[PDB]
């Protein structure tokens, strides 16, 4: 019963940067690209929202999740988010 | 009206190769482990080059498997291995073969034993000899 | 991976283009279109319950006249002897 | 029938004679107004017996069995309007006129009142229904079916113009079941074990057995247009019902060697159940069920005593309505995809929701809900043949439990998703698709109501 | 006496009238949910009747 | 019990030529959605993998067949085997029965059905 | 909306957090200890009680049999 | 029995609808999260499930573990019955010590709702019922059987011990 | 969508309405209103007992 | 699939398996880095049977002890609930024949259906005058290219470039 719009993701994908403490809050905020910032740095990026959103995450989300927002992109086609 | 290597034919060895895959593409060159070999053992009714049996089985179990639709619904195209017994069936768990459901059920089977015992509730037990004394013996007076 | 850039980038402007297409409802579009068209507690249940009352109760008075079994109600196990009897129980 | 074949044969000069397309309209028109007619002068009273007028008719009057006959040709014509329109209109209408030539031996025969003139209509038909099965059917392998269709029927036939004669010349005449009072006993010999076998064993080629059975499935898979005279042919085997005007009298003291008949008509009664749990083809899924539930009924004849005879008589007309109800769910999904594998029709039950309440109620019949005419008699096989013995139960019993899971395995084939294909298959069931639909649960469970009617003598 | 049993058969004849209203003959402004929990509602005093009957 | 499955194995580098076997399946895959996707088909796709299913499993099964082995003459131990077994079992009941029904009594007096 | 500020929960008491303590024997360290710290502290360690919160509290367990018996009694 | 768990699944649905997809006992919390009404449902029912010291099905569970007394059975199966009324109890804490009692753990954006007069309803009219279901029904009825009247010592009232532990 | 009367969280304890907490109160007393007749007046065993039945002389 | 990739597959639901099986919060967080350190162990090294071994002993007690019961996210491929939505299960195109009168709602939405077709109509002298050029034998999976150098439109178009929404 309660919506969704695209507001609410670009808020948690924007705090999981501070969240983490090893990236500090002073990097981009939609586009850091990851490699300025092997295993541990491409699952344990989205290891968290395994713990918050947590869909399984396939084995194609990987080599995608490198553009930060190319993270963020593909969840409003799968979680059918507003117009 | 599809005439061409309409069906299966009497195989298995009519030159084998070029069975997959001038049609009826099983194996790609006639090597991928699905080449019609797989004739079981013939002689019976079985399949002949049959683009049937013993390739890789067990389950389509609808999996993941997003390359296309590809495990059970949704029709790739030429795959057909076995069918009408795998809607409702599927791979291996964690545990494997040990039917200790035979010594689950044996849990009884000491306690069978048990079943030819009465069950009175008073006195107590005493089993050493027939100083129990169960029924009547004697009369009133 | 840098191939699928230009891919859903477009589609986002199609699939959720299609879907700012399906986000549409016209001033409610329904049209219906034609034609129209607590308290009471009056007929409401007395439509319900209490209309079946005298059918189903002429079907039995008109029962038992008829068939020879009839409602078969059993004995009257009574302890002492009473007024609907002559003798009394200690 | 005094006036019943008289008003039918004139519907014949009414096909080629009429107009244009008028010809469907009018051909169903009249022939509704036969069916008051059967119901009026028959249904009477009641008492050993109604002999009709004279020597041809006995008025059907220990088991009337004529009102079924007759529901048919009003039914399938506004089925077989699905896929027949594409050709000459004197090359259909030759089409319908053969159709109805096939009531007419059946209207007299059923009741027939002799036995030489029942040979000569138990072999009338035949004829039609291979003409059927050669021009306007499916793809090939036709001709060889028609041909099985043939030489078992025929083979098995032949020796009873063998026995029947020898009987004429022997004991009196059977032009007469009335005049059948005096019956010589038969005794176990090496000559009256044939004249028992002869007796018996055609009746066994209508009605299949495990053995000679293979070319039933055969005509229901290569089939007429859409389930066209495969209706009638519903009526086909179950019609074989002169078993129970013959060996009720007439070598009844021979039970000696019932047994092979018994055995084999039941571990084939419960293989045969399973033989198609793993077919592919829909047509041939309810073929195969209709040889299991209408086995049934042989041990109920064979085994004697009453109580067996009045599940029996119903038991004829249970799938007689059931299985031509399912035909006419599997003549239908076939004008859409034009392909009668079961296996391609994944993602049914959203397209189509009006009929999936149809599939319900049909498969409904086979577990079949015990206030039905279903099972209001099997159990009255139940109450026969365990007085024969305590094992018979479990046989049967099995029967009434893999039909449970073999009808539920073709509804849970309706329910699947996303159908990966058709653009076509769009239409949403048109009149005719669900007004034929009905009419067939319409009277059945309305004869559940007082089924007095359906009672053998008995 | 006869009453013991009535209120009964007429328990074993409402539960038909959701039923009979279901062939869109004059149907009540739909509310279906609320009309059946209305239907249970009265026959529960229904079948509280006979239950002081029979223990007396 | 069925299976183990052997869900896994080894590699690298064991046959290093054998990948692209989706390369047939991806032409076909190709030419699967080019005839998946059209402005107008109105009608099923013709799928020869079902049509090579049945028609070589319900027919073309008997011009394969030969009873050339006995394992093809199997069949009659699962035929005509249980067969003579249900008239074995039955052939010694109903006369059992029919002896105590004939010499003595054991039925109640009251089995009017029956 | 913008509830989920950083620079918000920042630990302080949180004993469950002392495992993160626990590990200054080996070193890992800082990152991280916010996702598990989420919504345990704060007045998220409401912590309802033993079985005195399966009488509730004993607030009404035994309430009102002494206040009902008794009068009349003669 | 036929008053409990149709509360009880309701009771627990109302919990499931409010996270919408987990149904699991894992990621569940305590019981006070802006909880207090369906807690106190549970409770009710919990403690009975547990083996009845003197809540709803009192009047029957009692009187038959201790009509086992005077029996003629196995005695393999008093020594089999009695002790899943233990493994009965065990159930009732279960989803206590793991629903209702820890720290609050389970995905964000909490959207509960506990709000709604129609499931009021509901849970109000079944535990007025619920809890005086043994105790008016065997209050008023005629016998038709004889009691057991001896329960002696050391056999009498342990299975109640039996649930404590 | 339609309604805001319960608001959405990020785990900060959204408040309830403070009404459904007094029929929590009142039913959590009367269900311990119970416990009077659990001893009052009800017993263990209303029976008597058996002296180990001995004296048969 | 290659050998660097395939620790990855592992590493993921080494963790997955875990916080099935714990209690806490914490107890499955302080586990995290404490697995860590034996993922840890060979850090960056070559990528022959040292790397295997690594991997050859991680078959025992990886499958050995897995998972009894875990978490499954139920809108997955496994678990409760995660077809469930099937009673709508989003028809679409079961809006061909309408038959009006029953079309009489939505009247702007049929007015923008038609429009979309057109895409649709006209889309193959532009696809597949790429699909001729950008499959060079048989080869590879056959997405065209993501802008079809001038516009994507879409390449799939519209069954998938309008798939099915979920609710
Ligand atoms: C605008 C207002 C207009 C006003 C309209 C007029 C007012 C209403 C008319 C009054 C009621 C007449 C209608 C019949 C129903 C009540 C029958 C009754 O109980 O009286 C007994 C009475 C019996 O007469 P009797 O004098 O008491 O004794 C004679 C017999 O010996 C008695 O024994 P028996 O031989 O009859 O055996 C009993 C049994 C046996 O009868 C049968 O079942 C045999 C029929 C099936 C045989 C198998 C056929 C297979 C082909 O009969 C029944 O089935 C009774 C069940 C109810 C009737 C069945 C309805 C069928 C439809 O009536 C009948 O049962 C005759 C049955 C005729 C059925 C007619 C059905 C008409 C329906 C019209 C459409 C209405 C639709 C309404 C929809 C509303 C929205 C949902
Ligand atoms: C094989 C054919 C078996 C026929 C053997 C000869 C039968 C015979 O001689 O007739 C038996 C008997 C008449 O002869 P009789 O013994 O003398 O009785 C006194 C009257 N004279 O009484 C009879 O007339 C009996 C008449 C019925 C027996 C003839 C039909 C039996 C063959 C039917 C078996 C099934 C068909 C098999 C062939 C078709 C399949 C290929």
Known sequence: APPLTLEGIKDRVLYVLKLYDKIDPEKLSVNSHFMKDDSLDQVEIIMAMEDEFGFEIPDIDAEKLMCPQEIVDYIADKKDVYE | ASHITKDMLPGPYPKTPEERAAAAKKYNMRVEDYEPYPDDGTGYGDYPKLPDRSQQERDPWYDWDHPDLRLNWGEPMHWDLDMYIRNRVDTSPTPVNWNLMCKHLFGFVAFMLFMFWVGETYPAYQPVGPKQYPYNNLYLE | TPEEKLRLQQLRELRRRWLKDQELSPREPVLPPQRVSTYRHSIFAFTHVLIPVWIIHYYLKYHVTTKPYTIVEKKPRIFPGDTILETGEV | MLKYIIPTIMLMPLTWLSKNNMIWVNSTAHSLLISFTSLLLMNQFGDNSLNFSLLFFSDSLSTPLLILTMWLLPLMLMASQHHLSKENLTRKKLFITMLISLQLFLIMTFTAMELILFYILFEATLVPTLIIITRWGNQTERLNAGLYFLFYTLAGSLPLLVALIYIQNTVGSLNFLMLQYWVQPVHNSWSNVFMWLACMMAFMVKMPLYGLHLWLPKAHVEAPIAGSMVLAAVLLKLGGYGMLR????????????????????????????????????????????????????????????????????????????????????????????????????????????????????????????????????????????????????????????????????????????????????????????????????????????????????? | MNMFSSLSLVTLLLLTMPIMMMSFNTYKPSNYPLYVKTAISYAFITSMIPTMMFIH | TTLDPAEYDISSETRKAQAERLAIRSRLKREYQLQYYDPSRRGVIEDPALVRWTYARSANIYPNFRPNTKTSLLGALFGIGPLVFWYYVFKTDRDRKEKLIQEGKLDRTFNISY | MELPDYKQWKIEGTPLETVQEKLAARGLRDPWGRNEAWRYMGGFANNVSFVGALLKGFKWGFAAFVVAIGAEYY | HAFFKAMLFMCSGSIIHSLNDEQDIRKMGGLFKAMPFTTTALIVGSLALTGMPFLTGFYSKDLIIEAANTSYTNAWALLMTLIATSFTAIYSTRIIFFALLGQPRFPTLVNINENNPLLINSIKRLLIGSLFAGYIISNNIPPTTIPQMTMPYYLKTTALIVTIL | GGGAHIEPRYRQFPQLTRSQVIQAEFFSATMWFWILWRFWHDSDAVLGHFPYPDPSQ | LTHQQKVLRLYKRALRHLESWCIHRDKYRYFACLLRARFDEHKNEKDMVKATQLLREAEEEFWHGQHPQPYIFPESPGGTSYERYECYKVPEWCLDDWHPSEKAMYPDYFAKREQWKKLRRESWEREVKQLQEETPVGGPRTEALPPARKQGDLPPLWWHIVTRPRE
């Open chain 4, 246 to 458: 013959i060996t009720l009298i007439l070598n009844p003291m021979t039970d000696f060697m019932a047994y092979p008949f018994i055995m084999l008509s039941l571990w084939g009664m419960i293989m045969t159940s399973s033989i198609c749990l793993r077919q592919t083809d829909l047509k041939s899924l309810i073929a195969y069920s209709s040889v299991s539930h209408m086995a049934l009924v042989i041990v109920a004849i064979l085994i004697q005593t009453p109580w067996s005879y009045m599940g029996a008589t119903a038991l004829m007309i249970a799938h007689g309505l059931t299985s031509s109800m399912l035909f006419c769910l599997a003549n239908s999904n076939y004008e859409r995809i034009h392909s009668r594998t079961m296996i391609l029709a994944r993602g049914l039950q959203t397209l189509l929701p009006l009929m999936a309440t149809w599939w319900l109620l049909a498969s409904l019949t086979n577990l079949a809900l015990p206030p039905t005419i279903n099972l209001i008699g099997e159990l009255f096989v139940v109450m026969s043949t365990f007085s024969w013995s305590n094992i018979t139960i479990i046989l049967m019993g099995v029967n009434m439990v893999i039909t449970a899971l073999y009808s539920l395995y073709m509804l849970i084939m309706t329910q699947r998703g996303k159908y990966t294909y058709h653009i076509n298959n769009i239409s949403p069931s048109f009149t005719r698709e669900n007004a034929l639909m009905s009419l067939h649960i319409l009277p059945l469970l309305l004869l559940t109501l007082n089924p007095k009617i359906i009672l053998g003598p008995l």
